[PDB]
Design a protein around this ligand. Structure first.
Ligand SMILES: [Mn+2]
Ligand SMILES: [Mn+2]
Ligand SMILES: [Mn+2]
Ligand SMILES: [Mn+2]
Lengths: 194, 195, 195, 194
């Protein structure tokens, strides 16, 4: 049932920040594999739940989280990147200033925790609806961001940057801000507020 | 269909003096019942999220399903694993115990030790690994079901399993539970696991 | 130097009827004492592994240090967080509670709810985040110390913290503990965290 | 104090299984960084333990495990690879046959669980001294193999194969057996038995 979404841009449009080969592999192989496996896992899960094998249904959870999370995360990620991303809306900039002091402080803080992820993971700018504040967080592997609405994600799995940056993850994390799609991020903010 | 609290295979006081009637009554009627009730609610929510294609919501419900589903699975096995007159391991289970642990005494020591060592709430398990065709021992956190092997005998070390009687002295409970291990059931589970 | 079990700032029966003298005596003299005794042993082993350059061994000891070290830290704070006559939040803490949670009633509800919801053994905490200069609530598993923020008030939901008195009814204990929250201490911790 | 060990071979000696660029980066950047950070963490830890900040000492644990584990794991890994690895000793082959049926079954089973690692991790062939049997296991991130003596490890962090294999982790896992250093593995087995 789930399908690989088309990117909102061509494979080379994020250069020089992220290469054509990376976009191509990342979308057509990595995200595709999460979608394919996700469809298969939902299948195994239904069989277990419909036949009453609660134990097997529990055993299938990590695979749903990993693949389901991979599909969720990458789907958001593509919308979060743009050749010409613009700037935050007035409402978002104001909120950024409120909760982080400045965009510069937010970028530094999110870059820092994202760079610090041990192993594979994601860094996120999110909106917490209960306390009505922007927050930053990281997630391991493909765990989706929970407890807050995702606004902007930074994939630090090595496949997100290795072909171009090799070991130098910090340069990729710092450079991704150049292609942050503030139009999309601001839209996600607006919707998270409503 | 809907999960139900299974009746115990004995009366609440049948395991004294190893486990008190008060413990047995709370443990079954309050703790296991709660897992069952919560499990039914969580399964309904999970079925809804799956049906609606709400992947994030389905994922968010997973800890609750594992906790309550695991609570149900674990306690259901645990009741069948206890008996005033449990008997002795079947010849084939005793022979396998000897083959894999040297003796029953060794198995009891090793499983008791790892079970006592559980940090916080959890369970100690004797299981059968079908791939390598061997008995193994393991512990699980919280209500995580034993996975990767077939459960044979479980020891609940959540403080509610023993506190009212044993207080802080978890080792006394773990050592004593062997006196009420239902070897008839454990042997049946073993025979079933080798099919 | 060697860790020691701190004396309670009150007598074992001083918190009745909210927490029984039996609970207080076991909790301090057996559970906390055990963390302290084990912590000293683990620190010695860890110091040895570090000195010898046994990296694998030092790493293997980490769960035991976190569990016992955390047990010590957590209980030490917990004793100071309880009082028969705790008083009321300082004006600055009350004002911050209002700023960050709307009211004290809201804070108590929100912290009680997440604390009640802890799966297995753990703790509920009111803390102060120094970076964002805000109060926050969180839970921790087992004896994991609250990290990333300064602990202000903790609620122990290990079953040994309440089972003898409350049995399975954890919510009654969590709601009731607010009646013995030592606001004098919590306020001092808050003032200290904003330095 | 800790230092980057020299490889027991030249950077291109594992070709065509693992490329010169991978060996170079993997050793001179990735393993080097674990060593450098490990030294720094031990420093922060000592200050915390010597000043009696138990809380800070606990906070430093993940960093010691990650960096300490990275140093342990990669140190073993280099010794586990060879252009001409030979074959298992008679004692090891016999033990492999005892606990897995055949070398083919062991390779399939270890390859399978290693391929299945979600995110970054390692696959291991180890020896359990208590039960006196070979076992296979996986570890997340840089967690060292615990509870058994390591004999042969397969690094499946994406940096271990991405430049050459890209997304195709299974081809790298299957191909690494060509360069398994059975001389070293058999020596580790012998020592684990004593
Ligand atoms: Mn990715
Ligand atoms: Mn129980
Ligand atoms: Mn306690
Ligand atoms: Mn590596």
């Amino acid at each position: 049932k789930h399908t690989l979404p088309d990117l909102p841009f061509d494979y080379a449009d994020l250069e020089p920040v992220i290469s054509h080969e990376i976009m191509q592999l990342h979308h057509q192989k990595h995200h595709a594999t999460y979608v394919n496996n996700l469809n298969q896992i939902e299948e195994k899960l239904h069989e277990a739940v419909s036949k009453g094998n609660l134990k097997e249904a529990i055993a299938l959870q990590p695979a749903l989280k990993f693949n389901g999370g991979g599909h969720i995360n990458h789907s958001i990620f593509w919308t979060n990147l743009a050749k010409d991303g613009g700037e935050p809306s007035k409402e978002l900039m104001d909120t950024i200033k409120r909760d982080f002091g400045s965009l510069d402080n937010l970028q530094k803080r999110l870059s820092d925790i994202t760079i610090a992820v041990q192993g594979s993971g994601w860094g996120w700018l999110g909106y917490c609806k209960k306390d009505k504040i922007l927050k930053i967080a990281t997630c391991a592997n493909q765990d989706p961001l929970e407890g807050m609405v995702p606004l902007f994600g930074i994939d630090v799995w090595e496949h997100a940057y290795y072909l171009q940056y090799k070991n130098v993850r910090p340069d990729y994390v710092h450079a991704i801000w150049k292609i942050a799609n503030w139009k999309n991020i601001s839209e996600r903010f607006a919707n998270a507020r409503q």
